[PDB]
Structure formats: structure tokens, C-alpha cells
Amino acid sequence: AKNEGTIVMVSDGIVRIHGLADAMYGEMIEFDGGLFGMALNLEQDSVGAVVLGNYLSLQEGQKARCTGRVLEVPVGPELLGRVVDALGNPIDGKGPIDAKLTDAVEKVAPGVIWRQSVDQPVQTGYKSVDTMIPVGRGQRELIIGDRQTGKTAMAIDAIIAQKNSGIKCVYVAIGQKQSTIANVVRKLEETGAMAYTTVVAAAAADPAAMQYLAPYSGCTMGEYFRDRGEDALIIYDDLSKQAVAYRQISLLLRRPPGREAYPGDVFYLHSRLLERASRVSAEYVEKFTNGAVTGKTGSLTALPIIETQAGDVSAFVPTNVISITDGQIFLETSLFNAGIRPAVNAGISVSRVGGSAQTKIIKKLSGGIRTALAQYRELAAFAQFASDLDEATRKQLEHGQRVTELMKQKQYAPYSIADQAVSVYASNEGYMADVEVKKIVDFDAALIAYFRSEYAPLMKQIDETGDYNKDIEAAIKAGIESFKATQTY
Amino acid sequence: QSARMVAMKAATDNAGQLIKDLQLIYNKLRQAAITQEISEIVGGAAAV
Amino acid sequence: SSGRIIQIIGAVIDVEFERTSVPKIYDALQVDGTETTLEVQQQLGDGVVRTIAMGSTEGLKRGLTVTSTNAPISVPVGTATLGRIMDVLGRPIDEAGPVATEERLPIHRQAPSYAEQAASTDLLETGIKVIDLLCPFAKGGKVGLFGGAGVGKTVNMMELINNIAKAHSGLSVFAGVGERTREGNDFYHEMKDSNVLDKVAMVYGQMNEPPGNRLRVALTGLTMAEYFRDEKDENGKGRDVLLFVDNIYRYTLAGTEVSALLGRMPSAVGYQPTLAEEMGVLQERITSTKSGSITSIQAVYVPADDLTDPSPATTFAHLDATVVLSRDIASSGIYPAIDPLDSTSRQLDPLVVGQEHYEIARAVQNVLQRYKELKDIIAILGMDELAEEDKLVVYRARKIQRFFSQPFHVAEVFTGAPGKLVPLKETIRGFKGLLAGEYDHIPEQAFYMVGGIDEVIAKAEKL
Numbered sequence A: 001a002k003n004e005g006t007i008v009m010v011s012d013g014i015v016r017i018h019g020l021a022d023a024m025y026g027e028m029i030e031f032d033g034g035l036f037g038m039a040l041n042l043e044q045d046s047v048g049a050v051v052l053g054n055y056l057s058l059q060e061g062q063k064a065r066c067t068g069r070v071l072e073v074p075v076g077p078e079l080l081g082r083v084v085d086a087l088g089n090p091i092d093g094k095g096p097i098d099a100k101l102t103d104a105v106e107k108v109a110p111g112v113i114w115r116q117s118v119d120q121p122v123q124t125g126y127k128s129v130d131t132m133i134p135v136g137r138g139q140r141e142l143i144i145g146d147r148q149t150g151k152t153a154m155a156i157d158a159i160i161a162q163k164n165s166g167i168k169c170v171y172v173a174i175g176q177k178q179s180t181i182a183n184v185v186r187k188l189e190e191t192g193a194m195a196y197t198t199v200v201a202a203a204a205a206d207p208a209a210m211q212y213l214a215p216y217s218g219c220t221m222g223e224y225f226r227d228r229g230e231d232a233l234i235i236y237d238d239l240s241k242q243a244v245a246y247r248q249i250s251l252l253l254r255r256p257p258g259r260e261a262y263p264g265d266v267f268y269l270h271s272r273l274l275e276r277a278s279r280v281s282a283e284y285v286e287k288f289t290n291g292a293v294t295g296k297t298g299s300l301t302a303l304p305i306i307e308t309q310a311g312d313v314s315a316f317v318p319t320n321v322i323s324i325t326d327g328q329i330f331l332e333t334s335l336f337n338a339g340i341r342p343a344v345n346a347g348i349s350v351s352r353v354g355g356s357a358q359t360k361i362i363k364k365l366s367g368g369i370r371t372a373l374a375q376y377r378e379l380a381a382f383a384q385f386a387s388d389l390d391e392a393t394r395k396q397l398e399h400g401q402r403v404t405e406l407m408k409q410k411q412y413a414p415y416s417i418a419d420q421a422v423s424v425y426a427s428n429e430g431y432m433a434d435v436e437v438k439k440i441v442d443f444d445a446a447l448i449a450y451f452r453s454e455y456a457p458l459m460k461q462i463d464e465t466g467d468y469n470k471d472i473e474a475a476i477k478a479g480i481e482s483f484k485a486t487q488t489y
Numbered sequence B: 001q002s003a004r005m006v007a008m009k010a011a012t013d014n015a016g017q018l019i020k021d022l023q024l025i026y027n028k029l030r031q032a033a034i035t036q037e038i039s040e041i042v043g044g045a046a047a048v
Numbered sequence C: 001s002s003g004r005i006i007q008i009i010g011a012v013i014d015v016e017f018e019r020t021s022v023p024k025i026y027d028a029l030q031v032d033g034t035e036t037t038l039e040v041q042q043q044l045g046d047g048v049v050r051t052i053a054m055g056s057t058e059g060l061k062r063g064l065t066v067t068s069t070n071a072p073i074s075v076p077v078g079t080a081t082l083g084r085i086m087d088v089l090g091r092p093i094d095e096a097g098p099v100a101t102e103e104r105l106p107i108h109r110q111a112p113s114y115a116e117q118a119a120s121t122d123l124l125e126t127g128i129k130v131i132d133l134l135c136p137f138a139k140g141g142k143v144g145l146f147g148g149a150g151v152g153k154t155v156n157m158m159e160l161i162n163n164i165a166k167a168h169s170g171l172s173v174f175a176g177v178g179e180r181t182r183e184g185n186d187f188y189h190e191m192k193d194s195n196v197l198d199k200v201a202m203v204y205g206q207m208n209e210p211p212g213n214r215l216r217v218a219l220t221g222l223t224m225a226e227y228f229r230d231e232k233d234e235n236g237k238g239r240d241v242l243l244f245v246d247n248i249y250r251y252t253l254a255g256t257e258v259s260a261l262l263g264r265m266p267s268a269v270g271y272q273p274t275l276a277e278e279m280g281v282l283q284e285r286i287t288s289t290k291s292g293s294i295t296s297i298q299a300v301y302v303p304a305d306d307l308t309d310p311s312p313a314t315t316f317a318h319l320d321a322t323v324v325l326s327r328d329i330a331s332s333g334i335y336p337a338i339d340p341l342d343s344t345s346r347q348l349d350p351l352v353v354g355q356e357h358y359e360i361a362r363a364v365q366n367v368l369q370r371y372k373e374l375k376d377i378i379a380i381l382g383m384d385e386l387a388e389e390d391k392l393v394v395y396r397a398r399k400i401q402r403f404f405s406q407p408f409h410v411a412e413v414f415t416g417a418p419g420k421l422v423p424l425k426e427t428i429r430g431f432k433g434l435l436a437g438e439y440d441h442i443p444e445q446a447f448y449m450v451g452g453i454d455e456v457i458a459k460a461e462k463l
């Protein structure tokens, strides 16, 4: 009757329905056994629909009914600290979620007149990326590298480092083994970062439709705090697996093939998703809330992750997504084995926002590190022939070696703004010119632990304000001199 | 010392030139490679 | 009279009409009760038309009515579009109100015929010393901008926009094909802050938009520029117009995506079969007619650093000049940052520009190439240990490099120094004098951000 149909073909998780004449594109449909489906092909005499669940219980001749509503997810602050499936059903076993309102999954980004310049900082706890590739609220930075190269670690550290920032976090896992998801959730809960984090999971055994629709639901859940003036962050662990699932669905639906068998509308798939990470203006927040909130601007930051095979960044999907984001972080396999544990390649990693997304002290102090790294890249083969160089170039090489060994850091130990500032100030000045090249890592921590125990007021002031005046510089210099004089490492 | 200079210089120059030609070959293969798969994939589209 | 949707698959939509009233190719349709528009793309049997919608197909069902405009997409053209931002359909997106223009033009039109071409090739004066001397532009020509970000690409665009209106009393049109929203907002606010928005019209096609929008966004700017060119002031004379393309590679990519969506056999390197034809449709309407002229400045991105790739290969067949921006020069402190050796122009021949200009340009390029050859010997073998002529070449090259830089007008509100527009003749005279050797004693520091030659003399004597 235009709201009831029949099933005529079941195969590979795809069901073809005959009926449902007034069925919209993307509308949900109800199968007989409390199951749901999404329509994606409206041919002349049939409807193509994917099943969001177990299709093994569906048989030819069963009935179906249209919901009349587009795909929706429950949204609110009551989803913090819970683990859910791609549609909002809890899987941690801690009880139902008392949802208050729902939101559509497919939405359009705000227009160009409602945007705002990005000038606020987001910290990740890694010195290498905090001083060289700044990330700001509303930016889009991409982490790209080969297998077992350190990609998830960095994302989890970035989520952890928001303990004292007030930024909510959403973590989306697509096509992963359930044991890894359980371990990640357990580690998050152990540290204490689960008090403000939401986790969406679509395991490798889940249907491809869920692995394809998960990131959109995650972004919708993350957009709650943007419209209300409060910042948020979202991480997609692998867009490559989403692309693979999309390709599988399209090929099973007979859409025309293309390079690597990808369908034509694949760039649009990631384009319409990544463009929703934006910083709206105060007028947009004032209009959306109908005057409830005034003088506040929202944001939403995205950190997609991409895996490449044998370093072939020229593949179809890596090239598609590189041209969309605002920067790239490259992780090398050779650097990981060589001992550089964060394994960030400086020289091909760029941030388009740049120094506008930093505090005063970090912005002042990043230039020395950048210059030292550039000069070390310039002259490095002279390591064997150091004695034949003049004094200036030898000093430059030694400083570059010290700096490039200072960038190494351990997992699950995010640095604070004061810690980074103290380390960089000790490096930019000549303090680390006496320590041996092999002992720099030990000296750096000892110096950090000497502070926060004898100079905690100053650390709190730096953390809360971020200012840089002659008075702060004097205190930092005096503390460093005292540590170098009295204590030992 | 001077002799070494010249010898070493030559090597660098040669290396540079070498890289260029390899790049050209690579590009060719790249393009060529892609075309082949497309044809095969199109064949699959006619396999039914 | 009316139609109905019979098939929805992604963006491709099939509509069915009556036996007779079947809309022609490229006609624009509108679905009643919705803000959706469709563009005819292919004609099939039984009066069935395959189209691509400009917008999204969410919340759309089979059986909806469609009304035909019986004409291509028409955009409003006039003087009321100066200082506004519109999308492909010419609708304001700046929340500033409707455009008061009531006259509209179609965006699909044939190129001018063989007999309508200009009877001569005339140069265009920009005011920038380096561009005029080494990469001369031509009314009706095409310039390809090869540069990254952070080399001052937008500043140069705004400077040209100001200069054309100041000198030749022209206007400009800006078209953004598949641009980021953040950078678009930044560019709009920079234009407003620099006071150049009044002389420009802007059309944006966003990256998050379907490929149909990004493919047909350049034709709207082209139509607006064409209308500006043919406006006749008293005593005729038309007008000279600039057009800007933020990136033409994304135009080809959008064409490829549309071809794949419609469904047809891929060409070599996965490009669509109709690539050169699609680009020649765009590049053959940018020419100098008897009434007036249109000059286009386009940004080009080379995929995978492969010049042999089909897209740059097709692009390079229509380019008359290439302007290359280098990060090395920008770090050196010499803005504008245009490489004087990797930048070439087809108009740098003794016939079009003259004999003395050709001689001066070739001499300057030879001196620069000589300096590029000599730096390595100084770097490795050592300083000096050389004849005098090489040293003179080095000093003259340094003086010329300093002299290429000049202040701009769009930065007056930032630095405070007034902008300098140097007439070509002054550049020719100054460079000829420098090459002759008269200014062999003037300090080189007087050549930096100093505009015209006499001004160099005044700054030198003052110092």
C-alpha cells in the first residue's frame, strides 16, 4: 500500500524489495524480525536496501514497512563514558542510555559566511607535533603511515591529553578485532579519560553497512557540542576500511566500476564527511540556541587515520584524502626501527594553519627548534667528517643532534604546556650543550620532575595563563640554573 | 685531495642524471600499469 | 508538459516526459515543492532524460513532478553583482539580500567565430616590473600560476585586481572550483579588509558539493566576465576584463567524476574519453574580440609531479605564459616572489614586443643564468679566486635581484608605505642603464623595495 512491500532477493547482506512506492532515499525500513534496513537504489521496479544487522534470518517473501524518517542517532551528554554500536545501542552491558533527543546522520556543513578563523590551540602531549605541526580547534590533521607504525598510539595520547581542557572526545573504530577495542577501552578507563569520552565500535565481523555508516554517526554525536558553543574532538581510526566497505557495497549493488574498482562517487564520500569539522562564529551559536548562549564560539576537530601499502602515497584513496585535509603527519617505518619512537618525519609534514594555533610562549619558542631541525637536515652526512669542519658548522651539527634526540618520548606520558616550555627553553639556550648525546632523554625528565615539586605555583601559572613576560623568563632561567647547580642526573 | 674532488664531483653529477631518467621510466610504467587494470575490470563488467 | 522521477541512484536521476515535449541537452529543470534543480545530460529512448541534480537527493522519492525552464541555467548579469558572493545558480550566500539585477544570461554559449578574432596582438600593462619585462601578458592570453601556499599567491591576485581597475578601468571576476571553505572565508575577509571587494564579483563552488556543482561553476564566472566585456560606454570601446580560476585541475577531476557517474568506458590513465574537448570548450571563449578583451589567470596543480600526465598535458596546450612562485626567493626576502628563470612567455619575441625589449630581457636572463652557474664554484672551490668579469656579473646579478622587488598597494594599511606602479618605459630605461654599467657605484641596498629608477637615485643620494 506504498508503506508495505515484499522481499524478492536476499544475497550477501543485500535485500531487494518490490513495493514501497513512496520510499525516500536513505529512509529506514522495518523488517519482520525487529531488523532495520537502509535504502540506496531506487530502480524502476525495485528498491535496493542494505540490512543493518544479521541478514541470515531474512527469507524471500517476508514483509517490510517504511518508517517515514531518515537515519537518526541519540545525541546528548548522557553518552559520555559509554561504548555503543554504530546506531546508539550500548554493548558494554552497563544498562540503557537515557537519551533525551536524536539527530540526523546525514547533514550539510555550515556555509562559508558562518565560519570563523582558527586561532585557538589543541594540545596532544607530543613535543614533535606540538612545536612543528600545531593543531587548532576546527582544523583537520591527518595521520598517515604503514602497518604497526605508531598511528593509534598517537590518537589515544591525544585523547588522553585533554584531561584539564574541557574538550569532549569521540573515538570511532572501524573494522578492528574486538580484542583490540576491548584493550583500548580498558586502557582509557584505567587512566581516567573515560569520564569525558564516547566510543563507537564496528568490529571486523560486523556488516559492511555498519562499518560504512559508523563515522557519520560519530560525527553527528560530536556535532552536539559545536552548535551549543562548547568544543569537541573526533578520531576515525581507519578511513581505508570504510572505503573498502563502501566499495564492497557498491560492487554488490552493480554501480559502474573505476580505477581499483572504486565507484565514481568516492571522493564525495570523504569530502562530505571531512568538511563538517569547522569552527562556527558567535552569530551561528546565538541563532541556533535562540539566544540561550551569547558570545561563545563552537568548534570540532578531526584526526582521520590512513594506512598505506609499502609507502605508496600515490594510491587512489590516499591521494583523495590528502587533498581534503589541512595538513599531514607522516610516520616512517625506518625511523620506528632506528629507535625514534614517535617516528614523525619532519620535512614532508606540514600544517596549513601554522603558528596561529599556538599560545604565546610556544609560538615564541618554536622557531629555534624549527631552525635547528632544518640545519640538521641540511648537514648530516658530515657526521663522520666532523673534525674537518669549522667551529660554527660543528656546533650546528651538535645542536641538531641534541635537538633531534630531545624529540623522543614514551607512550602514555603526555607533556604539559609548562613541561614543553621548560624543555624548549633549556634547549634554545645553551644549557643542553654539556650533556652527552646519549644521556639527553634522562636529563630532560629529571629536569621536569625537579619542577612540579619545587616550582609548582609557576607551573600552574604557565598552564592556566600561557603568557610570556620578562618575569616568567627570569623564573624559568633561575630554576634551570638551580637544577644544573645542585641536583644530579 | 684535488683529484678526489673531481672524481667525487663526477659521481654526484652522474647520480643526478641517473635519477632523472629513472623518474621518466617510473612515470611511464605507472601510467601504463593503471590502464591495464581498468581494461581487465571492464572485462569483468562484461562477464555477465 | 510536466515530468516525474522514475529512478534515483546517487546523484544520477532519470526523468520521464511526454512523447513530444522532451527537453533539449543542457536544459535546466526544477522539482516543484523542493529547492532542487536538475541539468539535462543525456537523452534516451521513450522520452527519458538522464540528468544530474545540483544539490542533494536525500528526502527524494519516485513520482515527484518536474517543471521545465526550456533554457540553460541562466544567471543574473550586471553591475549589481559587484561585491557579492553567489553559488553556481547565482544565489547570494552572504546574507546580504537579493541582487537587484533583473537581467539574466545563459551559461552555455558557442565560442566566437573565425572572423571575430582581433586583428593584432596587444600587450597588457600590469605595473609589476618583473611580470612586464620577462613574462609579458597579451589581451586575450592565458597565464598559468604554478605555486604552493605561503608564497603570497592571494596577495598577487588582489594586487592585479587593484591594478587593472586603477590603470585600464576594468573589472574582475573570481571563480573558485572545489575550494576549501576555511580558505574561502579567509580570502573574502582579506578582500574586505584590503578594500578590493568593490571591484570584484565572486562565485564559489565548495568542496563538499556534488561534482555537478564543481563542474559548472567556471561557466558562470565566464558568463559574467563576457557581459562585463561587451558593456558599451559612450563612444563604445567595451572594456578589459580579468578572470580568475582558483584551480583548473579540480575542473578536470569533476568532469572525470561526472563521466564515471553517468557510466562510460574510461580512457587512458582513468581520464574520461572527452577531456581535451571539455577543456577546449572552456578555453576557447577567453579571447580578445573587436569590442574588448578577457584575460584569464589560472592556478595549476600537477598530479604526482608528472608533467606527462594527460591533465597537465591538455592544459599546457592553451597556456600563453607561466608564472612560477618559489619558496627559495620568498625566504631570501624578495617579494613579490616570482622566479625570473623558470617563468616563460610566448610573447617574448622580437616581433610582438620589439627589438630593444627582447634584447634587454635576454641579456637579463643570461646574466641570471650565469650567476646561477657561478654560485656553486664560490660555495665549494672558494670565494674570489676568479677573474673580474665573473665578479662584475655577480654584483650586477645581486643588484638586479634586489631591483626586482617592489612595494604593493594592497599592503598600505599594513606597512604604511604607498604602493608603486612603474610604467614599462621606466623599467626598460632602468634595466638598460644597469646593464650598461652606469650604476656600478650605487649601493645595492638602495635597490630594495624602491619602485622606479629615479627613486633609486634619490634613495641613494639621501643615504
Ligand SMILES: Nc1ncnc2c1ncn2[C@@H]1O[C@H](COP(=O)(O)OP(=O)(O)OP(=O)(O)O)[C@@H](O)[C@H]1O
Binding pocket: A146, A147, A148, A149, A150, A151, A152, A153, A154, A341, A342, A409, A410, A411
Ligand atoms: N611512542 C612510542 N614509544 C614506544 N613504543 C610505542 C610508541 N607508540 C607505539 N608504540 C608501540 O609500538 C607498537 C605500535 O602499535 P600501534 O597500535 O601504535 O600501531 P598501529 O599503527 O595502530 O598498528 P595497527 O596497524 O596494527 O593497528 C605497539 O607495540 C605500541 O605499544
Ligand SMILES: [Mg+2]
Binding pocket: A148, A149, A151, A152
Ligand atoms: Mg594501527
